[PDB]
Coordinates of C-alpha atoms in Angstrom, one line a residue:
Chain A
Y1 CA 20.3 9.8 -26.2
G2 CA 18.6 12.7 -28.1
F3 CA 19.7 16.1 -27.2
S4 CA 19.6 16.5 -23.5
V5 CA 19.8 14.4 -20.3
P6 CA 16.8 15.6 -18.0
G7 CA 17.2 16.4 -14.3
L8 CA 14.2 13.9 -13.3
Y9 CA 13.2 10.3 -14.3
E10 CA 10.0 8.7 -13.5
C11 CA 10.3 4.7 -12.9
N12 CA 7.9 2.2 -12.8
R13 CA 10.1 -0.8 -12.8
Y14 CA 9.9 -3.6 -10.4
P15 CA 10.3 -4.0 -7.6
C16 CA 9.1 -0.2 -7.5
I17 CA 5.6 0.5 -6.1
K18 CA 3.5 2.2 -8.9
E19 CA 5.8 5.2 -10.0
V20 CA 8.5 6.7 -8.1
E21 CA 10.6 9.8 -9.0
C22 CA 14.7 9.6 -9.3
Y23 CA 17.0 12.5 -9.2
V24 CA 20.0 12.4 -11.9
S25 CA 23.8 13.6 -11.2
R26 CA 25.4 16.4 -13.0
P27 CA 22.6 16.7 -16.1
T28 CA 24.1 19.8 -17.1
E29 CA 27.6 18.8 -17.6
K30 CA 26.2 15.7 -19.4
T31 CA 23.9 17.7 -21.8
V32 CA 27.0 19.8 -22.5
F33 CA 29.1 16.6 -23.5
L34 CA 26.5 15.3 -25.3
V35 CA 26.0 18.4 -27.9
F36 CA 29.8 18.7 -28.0
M37 CA 30.5 15.1 -29.1
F38 CA 27.6 15.5 -31.7
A39 CA 28.8 18.8 -33.0
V40 CA 32.5 17.0 -33.4
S41 CA 30.9 14.1 -35.0
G42 CA 29.0 16.1 -37.7
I43 CA 32.1 18.0 -38.7
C44 CA 34.0 14.7 -39.2
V45 CA 30.9 13.7 -41.1
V46 CA 31.0 16.6 -43.5
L47 CA 34.7 16.3 -44.1
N48 CA 34.6 12.6 -44.9
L49 CA 31.7 13.5 -47.3
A50 CA 33.6 16.2 -49.0
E51 CA 36.8 13.8 -49.5
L52 CA 34.4 11.1 -50.9
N53 CA 33.1 13.4 -53.2
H54 CA 36.3 14.7 -54.2
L55 CA 37.6 11.4 -55.2
Chain B
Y1 CA -16.6 3.3 8.2
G2 CA -18.4 0.7 6.2
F3 CA -18.0 -3.0 7.3
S4 CA -14.2 -3.8 7.2
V5 CA -10.8 -1.9 7.7
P6 CA -8.6 -3.1 4.7
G7 CA -4.9 -3.6 5.4
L8 CA -3.6 -1.5 2.6
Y9 CA -4.3 2.5 1.8
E10 CA -3.3 4.1 -1.4
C11 CA -2.6 7.7 -0.6
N12 CA -2.2 10.8 -3.0
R13 CA -2.1 13.7 -0.7
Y14 CA 0.6 16.4 -0.6
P15 CA 3.3 16.5 0.2
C16 CA 3.4 12.8 -1.0
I17 CA 4.7 12.5 -4.7
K18 CA 2.2 10.8 -6.9
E19 CA 0.5 7.8 -4.8
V20 CA 2.3 5.7 -2.2
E21 CA 1.1 2.5 -0.3
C22 CA 0.4 2.8 3.2
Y23 CA 0.3 -0.3 5.8
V24 CA -2.6 -0.5 8.8
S25 CA -2.2 -1.7 12.4
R26 CA -4.5 -4.6 13.5
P27 CA -7.0 -4.5 10.6
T28 CA -8.6 -7.7 11.6
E29 CA -9.2 -6.5 15.5
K30 CA -10.7 -3.2 14.4
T31 CA -13.0 -5.0 11.5
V32 CA -14.2 -7.3 14.5
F33 CA -14.7 -4.5 16.8
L34 CA -16.8 -2.5 14.0
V35 CA -18.9 -5.5 13.5
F36 CA -19.8 -6.1 17.0
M37 CA -20.5 -2.5 17.5
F38 CA -22.9 -2.3 14.5
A39 CA -24.6 -5.9 15.7
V40 CA -25.5 -4.2 19.4
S41 CA -26.6 -0.9 18.0
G42 CA -28.8 -3.0 15.7
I43 CA -30.3 -5.1 18.7
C44 CA -30.8 -1.6 20.5
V45 CA -32.7 -0.1 17.6
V46 CA -35.0 -3.1 17.3
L47 CA -35.8 -3.1 21.1
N48 CA -36.4 0.7 20.9
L49 CA -38.7 0.5 18.1
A50 CA -40.5 -2.6 19.8
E51 CA -41.2 -0.4 22.8
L52 CA -42.5 2.5 20.4
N53 CA -44.8 0.2 18.7
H54 CA -46.0 -1.1 22.3
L55 CA -46.8 2.5 23.4

């Protein structure tokens, strides 16, 4: 997923003719959610590594 | 105008986004009309040239 959800998409899949432009819903909220989940997962990883090192 | 009227057109003019496809009305009748008018004009040209040469 990367780190952001763009507000525009360029699509060239059948049956669409050549290239078409499509518009996403609530890109900013989804970006915030993505970043927050990444941060929480990183914290979990750090704590797990600390425990494993302690052992 | 050339010698034919194609049935499809590719248009990339503002405000159209990128490139779009458009469809023409009665391409075949227009092609026939174009060719017929060209032939008649050619006959007229030939006759006029013959007259001028005769002079």
